[PDB]
Structures are given as structure tokens and as C-alpha cells.
Amino acid sequence: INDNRYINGINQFYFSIAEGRNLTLGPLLNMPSFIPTATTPEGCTRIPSFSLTKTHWCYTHNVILNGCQDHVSSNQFVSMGIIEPTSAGFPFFRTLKTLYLSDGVNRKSCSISTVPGGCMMYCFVSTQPERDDYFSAAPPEQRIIIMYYNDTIVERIINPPGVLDVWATLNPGTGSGVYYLGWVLFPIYGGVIKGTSLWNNQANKYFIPQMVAALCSQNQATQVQNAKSSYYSSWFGNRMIQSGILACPLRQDLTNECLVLPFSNDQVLMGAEGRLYMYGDSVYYYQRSNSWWPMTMLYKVTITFTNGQPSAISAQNVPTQQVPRPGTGDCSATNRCPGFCLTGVYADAWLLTNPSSTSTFGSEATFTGSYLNTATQRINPTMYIANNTQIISSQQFGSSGQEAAYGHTTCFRDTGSVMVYCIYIIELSSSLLGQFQIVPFIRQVTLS
Amino acid sequence: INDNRYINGINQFYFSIAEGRNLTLGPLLNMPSFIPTATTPEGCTRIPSFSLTKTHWCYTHNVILNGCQDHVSSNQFVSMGIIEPTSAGFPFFRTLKTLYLSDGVNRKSCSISTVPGGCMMYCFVSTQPERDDYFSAAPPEQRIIIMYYNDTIVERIINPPGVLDVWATLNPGTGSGVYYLGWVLFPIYGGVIKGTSLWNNQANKYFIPQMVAALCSQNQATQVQNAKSSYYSSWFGNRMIQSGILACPLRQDLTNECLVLPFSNDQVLMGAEGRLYMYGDSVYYYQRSNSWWPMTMLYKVTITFTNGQPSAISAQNVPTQQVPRPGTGDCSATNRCPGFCLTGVYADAWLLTNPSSTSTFGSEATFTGSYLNTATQRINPTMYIANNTQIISSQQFGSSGQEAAYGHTTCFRDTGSVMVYCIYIIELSSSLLGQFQIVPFIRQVTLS
Amino acid sequence: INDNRYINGINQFYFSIAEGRNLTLGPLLNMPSFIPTATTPEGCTRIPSFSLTKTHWCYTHNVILNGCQDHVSSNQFVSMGIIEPTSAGFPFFRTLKTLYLSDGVNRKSCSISTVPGGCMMYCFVSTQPERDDYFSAAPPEQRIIIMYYNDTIVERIINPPGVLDVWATLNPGTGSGVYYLGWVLFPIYGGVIKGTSLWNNQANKYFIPQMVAALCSQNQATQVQNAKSSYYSSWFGNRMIQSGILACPLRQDLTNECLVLPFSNDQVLMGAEGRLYMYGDSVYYYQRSNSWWPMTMLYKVTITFTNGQPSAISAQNVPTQQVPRPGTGDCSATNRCPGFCLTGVYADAWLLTNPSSTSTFGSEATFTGSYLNTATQRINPTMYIANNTQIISSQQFGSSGQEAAYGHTTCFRDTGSVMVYCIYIIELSSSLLGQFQIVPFIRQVTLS
Amino acid sequence: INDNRYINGINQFYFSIAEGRNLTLGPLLNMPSFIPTATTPEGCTRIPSFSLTKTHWCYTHNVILNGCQDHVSSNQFVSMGIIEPTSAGFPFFRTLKTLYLSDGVNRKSCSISTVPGGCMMYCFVSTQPERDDYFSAAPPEQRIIIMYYNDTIVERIINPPGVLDVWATLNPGTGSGVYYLGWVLFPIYGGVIKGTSLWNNQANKYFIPQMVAALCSQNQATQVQNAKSSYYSSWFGNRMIQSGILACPLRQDLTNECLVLPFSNDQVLMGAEGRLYMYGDSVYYYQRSNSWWPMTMLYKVTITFTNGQPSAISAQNVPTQQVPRPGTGDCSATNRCPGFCLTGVYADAWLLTNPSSTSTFGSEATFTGSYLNTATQRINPTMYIANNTQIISSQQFGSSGQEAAYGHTTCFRDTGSVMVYCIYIIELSSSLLGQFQIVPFIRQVTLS
Ligand SMILES: *[C@@H]1O[C@H](CO)[C@@H](O[C@@H]2O[C@H](CO)[C@@H](O)[C@H](O)[C@H]2NC(C)=O)[C@H](O)[C@H]1NC(C)=O
Ligand SMILES: *[C@@H]1O[C@H](CO)[C@@H](O[C@@H]2O[C@H](CO)[C@@H](O)[C@H](O)[C@H]2NC(C)=O)[C@H](O)[C@H]1NC(C)=O
Ligand SMILES: *[C@@H]1O[C@H](CO)[C@@H](O[C@@H]2O[C@H](CO)[C@@H](O)[C@H](O)[C@H]2NC(C)=O)[C@H](O)[C@H]1NC(C)=O
Ligand SMILES: *[C@@H]1O[C@H](CO)[C@@H](O[C@@H]2O[C@H](CO)[C@@H](O)[C@H](O)[C@H]2NC(C)=O)[C@H](O)[C@H]1NC(C)=O
Ligand SMILES: *[C@@H]1O[C@H](CO)[C@@H](O[C@@H]2O[C@H](CO)[C@@H](O)[C@H](O)[C@H]2NC(C)=O)[C@H](O)[C@H]1NC(C)=O
């Protein structure tokens, strides 16, 4: 279990709106990395997923032996441990167990989540190129593995209702899931078949961020028309790219009890990878900007239960225009107009301030994370702290041109020293060992 | 505990003399590294120590927050786990426990060893520059920490007899120690005070490798004179640099039961860092070539017990002229003549063949390891397989100029697939994160 | 252990009713304070708790680094020792052990109690403003730490039955607890949820001090109606503010054996901080006047055991109209009429005379303590000796306007010199170091 | 025993000459004071003595019940404990034992020192005004008390040779003593009788600080004449005021084994209170400037043993002109000319830098401490860091006019966080409780 210095400083809004204005990054601190490195120049470690809870943390990433492509074989590294203070005062992520799922099943795009006594991971079995998954009417196999600290492992192939013949594909969002009221929630996304109830109920819906108007040159009618078309991809089997949540009751005999809950396309953009968070009793969702709007998308999720079962989710967006991401073509970090896009990178963000503490939801929100500071290339990894319209603190890592990819940010507080630390797990391109080196950068978020 | 595929292929001579001639390296294999990386550009991880036994493995290295110098503060990372096969057939070092000794005590030059149920580590507390330790008549504090898999930790300050007022300094050799007949043996080295019994008993002794004559231009009388002088250092407080073994009985209340057993300077060169091995029931010793002879030094150690206690050690050298190490001045990889030197690098070697299987000890010995292939710079790390006079297989890592330091090699066999794997733990200079990246390179030693 | 001069003069009624009339305060005596001071102008030491028993004494207070607010971080100082005579004849509290609980857990409102061989402390973990605790349906975490004189420390998170879903919050009363018949009893208070059994069983109950009639202008029917409403707070989450006792069996593995015993709201006023005392074999309770009646509230508690376990408590009030406390608005020291109030200060009192020694319980009771002599400000600390209707001896400390807060009084006798000494631990506002300086004032209670 | 974070950062020179130039004070940190407060307005706590060693610390001060005068009765408070880190990272002085010597013996001007397993304290019994001690030919009684952590106390009346009929008086210097090579050394001072060997051997000797010439307007011949006369006091019985060291072998049956070693008046100024320090293996001495030179006086002491017994001491002054002290008349902080003076205050200083690390002893020395920043009044306590000619960092405490007296400074390092902390024990005039409040101010000495 985590040290007493951290058990009460996890999953919360650490700063008040007033304090949020005086936050700055501190120097990076050196700690023994708990994320394994590749041992060959061509080895590939990618797609991390991290979850920190009151008692412990869970971590996982995918491993490919040669290069970063391979839809036949890959292994998945899983790790778990706790946080304890060092003599210097800052955190040390103590790994207490390790697992390497290597058995022939090609588990991909996995999302992990902390659960009482262990970790619950959700993956889908890949057997062909991503694009082919969208064209095939049958969805890939879905699995959820529960790994207890007592070394018991239980993997189950799940068949949640409303998936077969509705979704051509279904993928975990790779971002961490969360344990909520006895259920494990995971972010999901995929392609929905034309003519299905979901497709019809989603017909004509669209979402346009609150700050797009002042930045977009098109008129309201044109924006609306383009926005509506952005949820359909001809490149990905003519499916409706959908975002949602997978709710699974914590059980060791899961079969069809998990529930697929799609977001209304009136509150969310085109489906993409994502992450779920817990700030106090409120659930939040991060949605990768893989569509036309290149800015960080965070939403407060309201979950509705009907007979002890999650029955519907509602999302409220924290309106911002900060922290863009590299994109291709007319969907670069500079784009501001609705239309169909299918490019971007995963770069979640953590809310250092409560969006509900302001009379108007998210009128003044502060968040931290990393982002690739460029218009179209996955280059220049840069850790930052930002508000709705500006970056108020940032430090680029390495020299310009430094390649990088995904970034997962998580913050917690030392209730002893009373400081906030954030860990920025970034996929860095390495020249020595492996294609990428996933680094758990850690530094303090100083108030002043 | 280790998988059934490895429990019977540890600490042995894997190949016959005939097979030794047809061994070659295989490609490096990608596995999740079990050695932690630094998370800052200036962080420094150095001086590893690794031990693999029938049941499990122990690992440790030193960590310095800024740069690789600091005689005031450092932490020590300890890790332990087992070996299990992956779906690809090769090993995965599964970490089952991690520890970060961060508490203000500057434990340095630590040597770790596997013990029933845990790891036993031996370190000395550094509080001043190395050179000052040799001038001060008092030796540094010596500690041995036992860490059980059940998380119980017992650290003890030891005061073995014959140390105070005899050794100006005493250091573990950093190379792994070994559990032997109820005792944990660690390699040690340090400086002995002039006038002490040890000094007198060692007076006029010297050792000259069997193959030095044919390579050295000086005559026998000159060699002998210079060899004798090589055990005394004016730069290091005018002490007799001595090599030896520290024998500690496995107990949780150690105080003065450990025994300091110095090697006869008639069988060993000037004291240096070292490692102890176990091949079947025989103990072997690796001695860093920090003196005039730049070639790999391995010895078969004969330990004598008197009343259940180690009372004397004898060393028999495996005569070779292969695998030189970078040195400074007239002590470069090209030197072959006796004289006083105090330069080199740690680069142990593993014996793939039994030196006693030949009518004349070590007449035909094969070993594997890594070495910095250059005359004076710690550059060009190169893994190899060699015999007494030649390198018969080798592959350099990275491009020329690639900086590196120490190298610890360990081999074991998959009694299932029947192949031998060797892990080459090398300190690599990194340009991205940290000063060094200690990498556990792994590859097969193919017969054919 | 305490000196022979005190072991037989602890926890008793020291004077007869006749003697009680001729008691006066003596000059303050100078002794080395055993309560630590802050070392910065803004440091804050507050909320003390003291316990003196036949063998030794326990002391503790909360420490906040900057200012006296902070619901994220605080440390708790614990101290223990004995009493010995000085050459001048008066007591010296000899500290024999000190402890500083600094680890990130925000232990607040702690109550300490003497136990055989050590101290037992009861605290709750604060993670948000007090008011929020009343609104949240879940109660804060509750912990009891046992600290033995032999330096062994055992802390346990307790979950006594009848707390979850009944009490929105639960707090120790900060006043000392007592070791009674193998159990440690602590005063508690908090808010009870509407609709719970406790709430229903307490419905329509109220208590009105015996001397309120002659001082209150409202009629009996109006008083009754207002009194009933005084146990409910709309400001504190619409809960029923309840007073009670927490009974814990002396064990090192406490989990859910402690018992929450609430007082009947027919014998006690609205819940508030409190203290438990031991006079011979009788248990007494002090209840802070945080409601409409501003006078010192002391009760003789009758505890009922059912199968070796405390099953019910009954309280009998010692009727007085002396020693008022500063309050806000219509609840100042001058108020005498029932109604809802939520203001006051902690100011316990010690009984120098047995209330049961009179034909009518407490008809003539004498007590000593300190009180802030003003109507609404926490100002003018004043030590005194009083009876049911009048103050018969008093001495203010410092000049008028001197700020102060809580006051804990404890008396004991020198069976050698045969004099009674009382220690008045008062929180004094300081201008030099820290916000407050908790002072252990000591003086004699002279007979004559 | 002290925490591992401090055991290796005690009694040393913490910074290099280069670093010494970039040192600044940090904010004061709040920790529970381990120095007891008075409990009456007139109570008087004065004359502290503190000693920190590798294993633990010792503390003591004198207590007078009414006012700060009284040559008949006083008690002496003794305390001992260790240092441990808090959750905030800074030190907490954990008191593990307390003692109050109250028995009728008026022990004054005590100096305490750490010894293996306890504390050794040296005091003299006062029975008349200080001045009378100088006129009486007989010296006061001298006692040394040893207090073990195991509660055993052994007090002995000592009669070291060469005291009777040589010294009219003898006093410990109140500054801490030190345990050195099996002996406890204490600073001493007193008046020597005219005609004695000591007096004759000291005849015509004098010392003039190296930097006095450039600041003094008198010529060399006048300075010399006045300097010589400064060691004789007509006000103090016409004695030669002498400084020295008392060496006592650690024994429980001391009688006349302690040795009085006077400093040569050619290397030291007129005798005054003092303190002894240990920096590595070197002993240092601080001499109160109670004579004409108002600047901090520190000396490196060379002790000579003859047959295992201290036989002679030699002092080498660290030449400075910084940190003056308040004085009376023509001996104020502004004075620079030799002559007879008998005024000043105790204000030791700690060397943050090694005076021997420079080609010319003390050519560039840095020290920290506190000083009363005024010319003649004991007012304006001010903590500082200074070099030979200037104060390079300082912060006054409280508002101007704030009365204060003695100041004892001690620094140590957190070998974990690698920061240096210094404790400034200052006698502060208080308006609330007691005449003085001795405060253990603590703050960091930051490098940068
Ligand atoms: C490791 O912990 C898990 C979690 O408690 C144990 O799981 C139990 O498994 C049994 C059947 O094998 C179920 O009937 C229980 O309901 C499970 N417990 C629950 C509710 O989580 C698992 O058995 C543990 N490993 C062992 C056997 O030691
Ligand atoms: C985000 O932060 C920026 C920078 O801190 C804010 O911009 C400042 O706004 C204030 C007005 O409140 C101006 O006085 C400053 O001049 C602005 N900084 C500059 C020069 O750009 C911005 O208001 C914040 N956005 C919000 C409200 O969330
Ligand atoms: C973890 O394993 C060790 C090794 O067995 C246990 O050590 C025992 O400790 C006790 C005293 O605490 C000794 O008297 C025994 O001799 C030790 N066993 C031996 C011989 O190794 C240790 O107690 C274990 N941890 C726990 C308490 O579970
Ligand atoms: C070490 O290995 C080398 C290379 O395999 C051996 O050299 C060969 O020796 C054989 C004779 O037995 C010759 O026929 C080959 O021509 C040699 N190789 C060449 C061309 O260098 C060497 O003998 C081995 N050393 C020993 C005996 O340990
Ligand atoms: C509390 O003490 C007061 C003062 O000592 C008592 O008042 C005195 O009562 C007697 C009668 O027994 C009168 O003769 C005095 O004149 C009263 N003192 C004055 C002048 O106020 C009071 O009776 C005591 N209260 C009780 C009975 O507990």
C-alpha cells in the first residue's frame, strides 16, 4: 500500500482557482524509472497505460520484438507497486510485482485500471491491420484480465450486449480506466455499422467546442454541416467513429455483464482513444483529438444507474483553446474549422483546478500535461501547465527535432511536504536502445 | 522461484572443450529490461552487481542525482526476481520485489549475493574522496544488509577482526558474491598499512601471468623487480593494494563473525575490484586488471575450513592473453611489461568451458564477456567469446566512439530448449536520459 | 513512574464540602514547561489534550507550520513522563519520552489517555473543512494510536459499528479520555444523519439546566420548544449534533471492537468537544458549552456493562450558573435563554469537591479552571475557583485584551506536604514566537 | 541514536571555499522547541549550553524562580535526545530524557558535553556575587556530573591540581565542551593570583588580532602597552583574567584527574566564557570578546599529549573583523583600540568553511551565528553568515529594540537531502512568560 504521505493526496483537484494562476513547473527530478526499456536497437515498447489510486498503481505497455509494426505477435508488460518518499523528499515508484503476458494472443490497445487488490486490464485481440477491422463486419475478440497482487490471474473473453452486428470494431482507449462504485469503467472507441439503432440514434448529431466560433472563419451553417460529417469515415470502412465507455462489474467470471455505453455525438467529437479520471467523486474523460479540433478535450461525465447498472452517460466539455497537437494536412495544430479528419496523437491532460468551482463550468480551468509542439510532426515533446487560452509554464525536453509520441500525465500530492508532483509518461524516440523509450518524467508543480 | 526450464542450468560449465571451439554469438534478443533508467539528463546510475542462483536473481546499482560524482549522497537500488520463458522461447527476468535504499547513508561499491530466501548485500559507507580513504589510517564503515523476499530487512555494521589498524581502506569488489557452504563470500580489496603482519607476510611476493614472458621484452630479473613494486601505491597513501575475500556466516545479528581472507600476492596481482563465481562446487574469482597486465584475470579458488570457518584461500590462474582493457599511459591495452599501474575498467568474464577438464589447468579455456575495444579510452563496448589467445566471436555495439564503462556477464542454460543464454550488463553512455544507461543485453551462445 | 509524593493523590475529590468554602488560589509557580513552543512567528500549536494517572502523564497537541488553518497538513506532538518534587517543594513534570507524528496523515482533534505502560490517542483524519464533513454522508477516517513507554507504536484504523451511515462526522472531544475497567473511554461528538435509529430515538428529547428557569425570561413551554431545536444544525449539514463516548478495549489489533455510546439528549446539551474524568471509581464528563447555555457543564456518568461490554451511559448534571464563556451574537456569556447556537470555547473544570457528598447531588459543588472573562471575545484568560453560583477566587493573567483560547485544568495532591496543585494548560496568543503558546500554568489551591 | 540522515553530517566543514561565497540564509522553519519555557512572568531561564554529536545531543540551562539574579538558589535543566526528519524534510529534536537538578546546590555557568552513552556537565557552585569570587583567594567548588541515558547519575566534586592557591576563581565557559580521544574537554576562564607561576609565565604576554592594525589609530608601541594591561582587572580583585581548557578523563570516580590547561596570553585575549568545537579531527575554540576587540574570536587548538595526558594547548586565530558585539563605554561594537575592558556578550560562531583549506590559515573563512546588532545595548538579535570582512547574509528577528542576550549556533547536514541546517539558540526577552525565552531557531544555509 502507498506510504501515508500519499494515501490522502490522490485523485483530487489540488489547487483553488486563485492558486491556479501562480503555478509553475519545477526541475525534473531523478528517480529509478519503473518502466522497462528494450534491450535491442529495433525492439519496440509503445502504448502505455497508467493508473494511480489511494492504495497502489498499475502500469502496462505493449512490446514488439522487431520494429513497431506487427499484427501477429506482441507481448504485454504489466507492473504494479506503491509510492514511497525518498531521502530527498520526492517519490519513488516501488514495483512490487511484474508480469509479462507472452503467449501468442496479440493483445493490443490495452487500458489498465486499479482495482481492490490488483489491476484489471482491458484489451482486444488484433489479427489484422487496423483498417481491416473497420471493414470486417465482425468485431475483434475482447478480453479483460484481472491480476491480483496475490499472483492469481483470471482472463476472460467478454461479449457485452450490443456489440455484435453493431460495432465493426471496438478498442479500449489505452488511457487508464477507473474503479467506480463497484464497477470498472474503461474508455472505448470504434466504428459503428450503418443502419444500426446506435447509428440511427446518433444520426444528425454533432458537437462544436464553445471557443471554435471566434477562431473559425466559416459561418455557423457551414460549421454545422461539416461537423456532422466528421463522425463518418470512408477510409475506415464507412463506419461512424464512436467514443464511449465500457462498464464492467468486478467479477472473476465475466462473460456478458460488461456494458457498452456510447457518448452522445452531441456532446463529444469523433471517437478516439481516451482516458477516464476520478477527481473526488466525479468522473472525467479525456478524448484524443483525432478529428478537426486540435485542442485538448476534457469532459465531466455524469453516469446514470438504473437498477444498480450503468445505463447512460452524459458529457460536459471544459471549453478551451489550449494545447494543440500535431496533425496531418488540413488538420494540423493550426486548424480551427470543422470537417473530416483522422489524424493526431494521444496527449491527455490533468486538471489541477476544479472546473465546477466557477459560476460557469470551466470558465477558468488549469491543466498540465505534455504535447508535441509542432504543427504536423510528432516532434518537440513539451511539458506544460495551461489555462483555457494560454500556456503559463512549459519546458521542452531534448533538442528541437526530438521525436516523441503519446503522453500520459498524472498528478498527486505529498500531504506531508504539501507539494504536488506530476508524472509525465512520454514515448521518446531513442537512438541507443529500442525504437522508443517510455519515460516516467517527474517534477513538481510549484505554487508561486 | 525460477521456472523449471532454468533451475537445473545455473552456475555450471555448459560446454565441453571440443564444443568450445565451435561457439558463436547470436543476435541480441529484446526483453523488458529489469534494470531501472534515470529520469533526468544528469541523473547517474552506475556500479551494478548481479547474482543468479538456482532459485532466483539479485540486482543492484548506485544512484546519484546530479552527475556521477558525489561523496555525500547517493541511494542504492535493489531488485530481485526469477527467470521465466517467453512465447518466443527466450528468458524474461521477472522482478518480484524492488527496494530503494535512500536514507542518508552513502553506501558505495556494493556487492550483492543470492541467499536462501533473499539477497545479502555488502557495502562500505563513503564520506570522502576515494584517495582520502587510503591516507586516513581508519577504514570506512562496513555494512552488510540482508533483504528477504518476505520484505524483512536487516542491516548490520560489521567489524571483522584484522581490519582496524591493518587496512587503511576496505571495499567490496562490486562483483557478485556467492553463497557457499552456509557462508556468503564477497570479493574485497583495499590498502594495507605498512608494518602490519599482513604487509610483512606479503613482503617480497609477486605474481606474473604465465603468458607474459613470450610477450614482454624485459628480462626475468627486471620483470620480477617491477612486479614486486606493483603492489604498492604512493598515490593511494603508500599502501599495499590488496585483493581478498570477505566470508560472512548467514546470520541476522552479524557483528564481528565475518572474516577477511586476503589472497597471497604470489598468486594474484595488485588488489582491484572483483567478482566471485560458482561453477558446480568450485569457486572462481575475477580480478579487475587495474595494474600492469591488461588481460582478463580468472582464478580457481580453493577455500580451506578450520573448525567450520574459512581459514585460507588459494588461487590458481587460468593463463590467457586475451581480452585487454583500456588503460592510461604506459598501462594501455597494449602494455605487456611489469611495473606500477593504477588504471583500467571492470570487465569480468564467464567460463563456458571447464579449465580443469584439460590435463594442464586452463590449457584450453573459453570465456565470454564484454570489453571496451580501444587502448586508452572507455569506448567501443564489444561482446565476445574468446579462448586463451584469440577472440573467436564478437560484435561491437553502437557506432565507434560509443562510450561505456563496466560490464558484468552471466550465462545460464534453458534445459528445455537446451540453449545457453548470456546476459551482458553493460554501462552505456546515453545522450537522452541520464549519464549512463545500464543495459542487460541478452543473446544466445550458439554451438556451431 | 510518579514520585511517592503523588502516586496516592491523583484522580480524587481533594476537599470536603466545608473546606471547599475556604479555598483560594496561590501565586503561580515557575517550573520548566513540558509543552513545546513554536520556533517561527507563524507556527501554530493548538488543541492540547492532557491525562494524569497514578503512574504517569500523557500530553499532546496539534502543530501547523503556517498559520492556524490547514486541512491538508499538520503534525501531532506527543509527550509522556512523570511528576517529581523540586527542592522548592512544588512539582516538575519530567518528560521521559517525546514523539512527533509527522507523516502526511492529517490527524486532528485528538484526545489522549493514559494506559498501563503508555498512552492511547484517538484522532480522526481531516481532509476538508469541518463544515464539509457534516454535509458529506461518509464520516472521516478514525484512528487510535497506542504508544508504549518501550517505544513500540501501534496505530489502527477503526470502524466501530453504528458509525457508517449513521454519523455524517465523528470527532474525538480533544479532552482527555480515561482508562476504566480495562477499557479506554474517549469523549466524542459529531453529526447524526436524519432518519437513522439514533436520530429517531433522540427525537423530541432535550435538556434544560436546573438553574435556567430563574434566569430565563421565556416561559416553560417556549423554553422546551427552543431547547428541542438546539440539537439540529442547518449550518452543519442539517445534522443532529450529538455528544457521546467511544469505548475501546485495550488491544493492539483494534478494528471494530470500539463502541460508540451516545448520551441521551434528555440529559445532555447539543454535542460538543468534551473531556472525561475519573474521581475515585466514578466517571465524570465535561461538555463544552457550544450551544445556548454558556455555563460550565459537568456530569456524573453511570456506565452499564452487558457481557463485559459497555452498553449504555447515563449522565447526571451538576447544576450551576457559574463560569460563562465568550460566545457570538445572542449566545454570548450573558445569554440565558434556549435556542439554537453554535459558538463557544473549550474550558473544562475540575471538581475540588464531591457532588455526591451532599444530600442533593451537586447542591454545593466547588470547581476550578480557567475561562475567558468577556462576553463575545476570546480574551482575558482568568484562572478561578468557583461554586454553583459564584466565583470565590480568581486571578486574570496578563493585561486586558490578552487573547487566549482553550483551557484544560487538572489537579493532584502532594501527599507529603499535603497541598493541592492544579495545572491550567491555556492556549495563549503570543506576539514573539508562534500564533499561540500553550502554557502549563501551575499554582496551589490553598485551604484558608 | 540520531537518524541515518544525520549520523554522517555532524561536526564537519560543510562547504568549500568557493561555495562559501554563495551561501544565504533560508526562512526560519517551525519545529517543536526542545527547550523548556518558564511558567511565570518573573521566572528566569538563562545560560544555555548545547552539544550535538554523531549519536545524540545534550542541552542544559539555568533556572531562577524570581528574576535573573540570585546567588543562593537555582536549578539546572538538562535534556537529551536525537535528531529525526519530519514529513516536511527538516529536523525534529526528539527529547528522550529530561532532568531537573533541584537540590540546594547552586550550580552555575555550566558547560555540557556529549559523551558515549550520555552527557557530562561541568559547573561551579556559586555562593556569592561574581565579583566576590575574584577577591576571595579560595576558588569556588567545582563539580562535574555524568548523566547516562540509562538514568544513572554520578556527580563528583573535583580538585584538579594547580587550582588551589593559583586561581582565585574558575568557571566553565558555558559553551559546549567536546569528547576528544577519551577525554572530555571544557572551556574555562577565571582570575589568576598575582605571584603564582602561571602569573609569572604569563607576564608580559599579549595578543593583538591580525586585522587590528589597519583599523586602529594608535601606533604599534601604544597598542602593545595597552594590550598587555588588558589581562589584569582591578575591578575583579586585581587578578589576571585567564582563558583555558579543563581536560577530564571519562571516569565515574573523578577527584583530581582533570587537568587545567591555560592558553598562552600570546595567542589569546583576556579570559572569557567560551566554547569548544570539533571539525573532523581538529579542535576549535570560541572566545567571548569581553575585552577591547569586539569581533568574533575563533581559534584552531592544537593539543599535546604527554604520556596519554593533555599537557599543553596552542591556539591559532582565524583573523577577522566581522560580527561585532554590544559593549559598554569605550568598548562598544565600534572600538578598535587596545586597552582594558570588561564588557560584552556571548555569541559564538560556526565555521561553514575550513580555515586550513587556504594557503594562509583563515585567509578566507565563512561562519554563521547570531549577534546583537547595536553598539552598546543587548538589542536587535540578528542571525547571519559572514566572512572575514563582511556579513554576506543576515536577517534580524523581531522589531528593533527587541532585547536579547547570548547566542549558541550549531550546524549539521542532512546527508539525504544534502542540505545544511543550523540551529541558533538565542536568549530572547519575553513580555508574556518569563524574563527570557531561550529559542532554538532553525533554518537552512542554502548554497546559491
Ligand atoms: C487472490 O485474491 C482473490 C480476490 O479475493 C481471490 O479470489 C476469490 O476466488 C474465489 C474462487 O477461487 C471466489 O469464490 C471468491 O469470490 C474470490 N474472492 C473475491 C470475492 O475477490 C483469490 O482466490 C486469491 N488467491 C488465492 C487463492 O489465494
Ligand atoms: C490564462 O493566463 C493568462 C496569462 O497568465 C491570462 O492573461 C492575463 O490576463 C490578465 C487579466 O486578468 C492581464 O492583466 C495579463 O496581462 C494577461 N497576461 C498576458 C500579458 O497575456 C489569461 O487571462 C488566462 N486566461 C483565463 C482567464 O483563463
Ligand atoms: C522473513 O524470513 C526470515 C528468514 O527466515 C525470518 O527470520 C527469522 O527471524 C527470527 C527473529 O525475528 C530469528 O530468530 C530466526 O532465526 C529467523 N529465521 C531464520 C533462521 O532465517 C523473518 O522473521 C521473516 N519475516 C517474518 C517475521 O515473517
Ligand atoms: C583459439 O582459437 C583460434 C581460432 O579458432 C585457434 O587458432 C587456430 O588453431 C588451429 C590449430 O589447432 C589452426 O589450424 C587454425 O589455423 C588457427 N586459426 C587461425 C587461422 O588463427 C587457437 O589455436 C585457439 N587457441 C587455443 C589453443 O586455445
Ligand atoms: C458560593 O459562595 C458564595 C460566597 O462565598 C456564597 O455566598 C455567601 O453566602 C453566605 C450564606 O451561606 C452569606 O452569609 C454571604 O454573605 C454570601 N457571600 C456574599 C456576600 O455573596 C454562596 O452561598 C455560595 N453558593 C453556594 C451555596 O454554593
Ligand SMILES: *[C@@H]1O[C@H](CO)[C@@H](O[C@@H]2O[C@H](CO)[C@@H](O)[C@H](O)[C@H]2NC(C)=O)[C@H](O)[C@H]1NC(C)=O
Ligand atoms: C549505565 O551505564 C554506565 C556506563 O557503562 C554503567 O557504568 C558502570 O558502572 C560500574 C560500577 O557501577 C563500573 O565498574 C563500570 O566501569 C561502568 N561502566 C563503564 C565503563 O562505563 C552503569 O552501571 C549503567 N547503569 C546500570 C547499573 O545499568
Ligand SMILES: *[C@@H]1O[C@H](CO)[C@@H](O[C@@H]2O[C@H](CO)[C@@H](O)[C@H](O)[C@H]2NC(C)=O)[C@H](O)[C@H]1NC(C)=O
Ligand atoms: C567577503 O564577501 C564580500 C562580499 O561578497 C567580498 O567583497 C566582494 O569582493 C569582490 C572581489 O573578490 C568584489 O568584486 C565585490 O565587489 C565585493 N563586494 C562588495 C561590493 O562589497 C569580500 O571580498 C569577501 N572577503 C573575503 C575575501 O573574505
Ligand SMILES: *[C@H]1O[C@H](CO)[C@@H](O)[C@H](O)[C@H]1NC(C)=O
Ligand atoms: C500568487 O502570486 C501573486 C504574485 O506574487 C500574488 O499576488 C497572489 O496573491 C498569489 N496567489 C495566491 C493566493 O497564492
Ligand SMILES: *[C@H]1O[C@H](CO)[C@@H](O)[C@H](O)[C@H]1NC(C)=O
Ligand atoms: C563443430 O563444428 C566443426 C565444423 O563443422 C565440426 O567438425 C566439429 O565436429 C564440431 N564440434 C562439435 C563436436 O560440436
Ligand SMILES: *[C@H]1O[C@H](CO)[C@@H](O)[C@H](O)[C@H]1NC(C)=O
Ligand atoms: C475555613 O475558614 C473559616 C474562617 O476562618 C473558618 O471559620 C472555618 O472553620 C474554616 N473551614 C474549615 C473547616 O477548614
Ligand SMILES: *[C@H]1O[C@H](CO)[C@@H](O)[C@H](O)[C@H]1NC(C)=O
Ligand atoms: C555560486 O554562484 C555564482 C553566481 O551564480 C556562480 O558563478 C558560482 O559558480 C557558484 N559557486 C559555486 C561553485 O557553487
Ligand SMILES: [Ca+2]
Ligand atoms: Ca471488424
Ligand SMILES: [Ca+2]
Ligand atoms: Ca581510511
Ligand SMILES: [Ca+2]
Ligand atoms: Ca462526513
Ligand SMILES: [Ca+2]
Ligand atoms: Ca575566589
